[PDB]
Design a protein around this ligand. Structure first.
Ligand SMILES: CCCCCCCCO[C@@H]1O[C@H](CO)[C@@H](O)[C@H](O)[C@H]1O
Ligand SMILES: CCCCCCCCO[C@@H]1O[C@H](CO)[C@@H](O)[C@H](O)[C@H]1O
Lengths: 427, 428, 426
């Protein structure tokens, strides 16, 4: 049957894995068997996840050294500004859709009570300076072993830049050594991209396994009030994709329907693995094989976007903060909701995509606003209710971000004329 | 001429074996007369230096050789070598179980007298770890596994990288080929440098082998007396039988001269003996496989690091003997079948753990714990285990040495069946 | 102002950062504002420090693999014994100047009281054997990730040596792989040196920010008895430079004023960052571009000197031990002071340059001689006083060491005929 699996056409095969996994998950959970799914099905999904994590640091280091050597510093600076401007614009929309859909569904019509008290807290206050200095790795070997994406990005860019300067120096020995070094990262990045392609042979089984477990454990819990939270958040995702990303792509002359079909492997993988960083090898290959984006762009914008994209956060916090407020009957005006989500968005920036993100962040938000989280308390209850569906929300939060990352990469690539247009011609 | 120059000018063929024999003799005399403390201070640091110089080479030599190795051979054959080497380790561990049970009962370990309370068996609770042990083969951060010195995920990452590299060197784009080849040369350049450094370290090895064996003999030599002398006897007979019967017959079946083999292995065996680490001997075992046995890197760069973590032979022998010793010491009745189930579960539980000093004592303590015996201080089983624990280094040397031998034997066998053995190294 | 900063001539610009920062620091501190300096000014200096730390492990690894390939093992061994002999000579002098200036200033005429009078009551010999064994890394990838310089030096030397053996082999495949490997380290070292050059465009801003903060916090605290401690220590530095380093440079035929002009960037960076290792990328680039030392020399001697140079320690311990003894009125003979300093110096070897060095070591010395460090006690009081100016002393301690490292590197390079004379001729 190993041969019957592989010879089935691979174009949609991963997407079959998703729907069949999700159905199998729901049925298994509804009938009690979510324990069996955890034992027998999930290790196959954990395997998919490990194989992709294995590739993240090599592919990020090697692609960005090769990439940053390939482009001049001035243009790299301009890509940096373009992708940040992009991420501000789209997070502004994400906050908007976060506020609207939460209120449309009017999340939280169940009843606990408390308004407080504090628990009066100040607190930190949230000083970014050390977050910024920490971008510079003090030991680039240590950042690789510890898996720190942002200091590795910084080291890869300066090394890549320096290499190109050396290759333009007069001394031949200097040019040849720098080029040998550049070739090694080219060889390594290339090998990593090859492995991704092989791992993606396994992906439909892995995608099946992961989505099955999530559905078996937390599917049965989407009912009543929490069904409206899932509905609101997923509507928010849908709007962010088909409005914010589609209009911006169209404004810049990219066919948005072509985009989605090229993104699907990145989007589904982001959905089940619930990690922007762990999806990077897939998102980066998609940017290469499918979108036709030059490594000079995506080797920077994608790993950067995996840590700074605020879109999924704004949607999650917008919906879940309202759910908590209505559940405990705390009056929250629209502007006050905006202030809360913005401080959670600002507080989240540096953090890379990691499972269990917004639930941890939501808990911080409730504490900093002075709410009582002691066990048994109404807010502890509302928080626990969100916590129990958190994976179902995490999948959507992660999936909307990688899509936004690809969109912003493709857009900036186009504005730089680093987008290969032949990849977008269909037969 | 100074003492430095006369030491190195002595022919190196047997010099490590003199380091072993003079080290062991020196050790015994020092201990019998009280001086084991001075040995620890003055003699032993030189052996520890040997141990560190070899450890230094394990991750670079294993990574670089396996990328080079896995690039040099096609995936299909690499799978076949994988299955061949696994089947070998099953066969030989069965023989190790067999001799472990036999030699233990022939010597009839125990007949010192305590009396124990309780059993058993096998509850308490198990539980299975096997799936997560397999998933853990895949490193989530290959830089971390290197920095943490994890051999089994480095084996996996090295193979995946090597395979990918030749695919790139066979593609059409010239830059893609040219980069992949540069990358391959970097690992080839590094691997070559490590094998050269091993060669340099082995000039120091007789001194190190001397220092290590002297220390172990001085501390635990005096403890081999009475009942415990029979534990040592049984285990070492187990080794001898496993070598001269199991490894010798298999080597003969596949047409390798078993006497030539031992002469070629001796440096790896002695190094395994004193360092008591399969992983830490790998640079020596891999160089023996190259210079002496004449095995292609496509074979031994895989089978040897894998064998350092999966070889069950030393475990079957240790557990076989010592489990009987505690049972007889506490007068607990143990049928031949009951001993067999215990050794097998200790063997199955041990798979995947690489060779590390203090292995069997830790595993033995687990085996007694899982069968429900009372290890509280003062108790008969706590007493019998403490007796084993005190000679454990002497047993550890034999346990490591038999495994690295079995690793070389299976590597040589698989290499021959693959026609990857250089016959010129063997012709008399 | 982005443009006017860069177009100002770079010749002296870092030293203006130091002087203006130090003046700015003192004034800001005297007026209460050392808190604002910590918030607004210091991150610019911390940024300077991180950018340099980033480069330490790559440049040390790569320069030494390349360097040890470029030169024969025999010469490297002689360079090793020459540089150690150099460090014994100069530390002997540093002990001397430590004892002299401490007593000249007669540090500690303030009055507490208590007397320990005990020796080796801790009690440890101590035992160096494991310290030596620890030179050999058990996992060179681990030592790199942990940033351990001395085992990386060891691994780099043998890898470099092995590489040239392979590049002399008959098999062309072996030769070509080894050369590819050697080119990778050559390419990386080259890139690091290029980046150092860029960071040093920022150095005046960084140097300003660092000296400003230190001056703002501890400048106000150097007064009364503690002013005599700082006076004593900095005179010791001065003498160690203008006497020990200058005479040695002249004995071997190097112009000492030319030397000083060339060393200044390493010296000022050593001064403000208070780390020999963190200054290494700057000290090594200075040895290459300015001194004209071959990489075969400095890629080894300089990282070694960052962990073995005892000059700053001998000076620090000499003065502060006397301050403590006089502050508590404990009679201390000149010979007894010598025995204490040497055991502190022997105890310090192998530790690389790190901020907060001597304060920790002083605390051990007081403890190991049996003095009472419990809160409120005189020695705890005298120790706390030193502790509060420690940064001002640390700057001077690191700056004299990096100077001595460059001095000894240049001497060995000259005796090995690996110094390029065209850089010195003018
Ligand atoms: C431990 C090493 C495992 C590597 C095994 C690789 C799979 C070997 O298997 C072979 O792989 C080829 C790949 O094209 C296939 O063409 C063959 O059908 C298959 O027999
Ligand atoms: C204060 C110590 C300064 C460094 C010591 C200088 C060493 C000078 O002595 C050196 O001995 C070598 C003999 O092998 C020769 O090769 C050198 O030419 C010679 O200068």
């Amino acid at each position: 049957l190993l041969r019957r699996y592989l010879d089935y056409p691979v174009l949609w095969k991963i997407l079959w894995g998703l729907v069949l996994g999700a159905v199998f998950g729901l049925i298994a959970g509804h009938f009690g068997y979510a324990g069996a799914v955890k034992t027998y099905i999930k290790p196959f999904g954990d395997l998919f996840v490990r194989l992709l994590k294995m590739l993240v640091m090599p592919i990020v280091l090697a692609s960005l050294v090769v990439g940053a050597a390939s482009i001049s510093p001035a243009r790299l600076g301009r890509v940096g500004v373009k992708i940040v401007v992009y991420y501000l614009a789209t997070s502004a929309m994400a906050v908007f859709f976060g506020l609207i859909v939460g209120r449309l569904f009017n999340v939280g019509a169940n009843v606990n009570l408390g308004s407080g008290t504090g628990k009066a807290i100040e607190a930190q206050p949230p000083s970014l300076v050390q977050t910024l200095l920490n971008i510079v790795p003090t030991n680039p070997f240590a950042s690789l072993a510890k898996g720190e994406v942002l200091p590795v990005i910084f080291f890869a860019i300066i090394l890549g830049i320096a290499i190109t300067y050396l290759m333009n120096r007069n001394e031949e020995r200097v040019r040849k050594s720098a080029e040998t070094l550049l070739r090694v990262f080219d060889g390594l990045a290339e090998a990593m991209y090859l492995i991704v392609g092989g791992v993606m042979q396994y992906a439909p089984i892995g995608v099946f396994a992961l989505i099955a477990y999530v559905m078996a454990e937390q599917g049965v819990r989407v009912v009543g009030p929490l069904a409206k939270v899932v509905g609101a958040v997923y509507t928010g995702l849908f709007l962010q994709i088909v409005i914010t990303y589609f209009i911006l792509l169209k404004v810049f002359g990219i066919d948005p329907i072509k985009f989605i079909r090229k993104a699907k492997d990145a989007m589904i993988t982001a959905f089940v693995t619930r990690s922007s960083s762990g999806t990077l090898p897939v998102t980066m290959r998609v940017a290469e094989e499918e979108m036709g984006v030059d490594k000079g762009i995506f080797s920077f914008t994608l790993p950067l976007g995996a840590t700074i994209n605020m879109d999924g956060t704004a949607l999650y916090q917008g919906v879940t903060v309202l759910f908590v407020a209505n559940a405990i009957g705390h009056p929250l005006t629209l502007g006050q909701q905006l202030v809360v989500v913005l401080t959670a968005v600002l507080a989240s920036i540096g953090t890379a995509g990691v499972p269990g993100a917004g639930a941890i962040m939501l808990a911080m938000v409730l504490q900093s606003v002075g709410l009582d989280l002691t066990p048994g308390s109404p807010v502890a209850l509302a928080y626990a209710m969100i916590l129990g569906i958190d994976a179902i929300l995490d999948m959507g939060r992660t999936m909307v971000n990688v899509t936004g990352d690809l969109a912003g990469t493709v857009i900036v690539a186009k504005t730089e004329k680093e987008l290969d247009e032949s990849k977008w011609i269909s037969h």
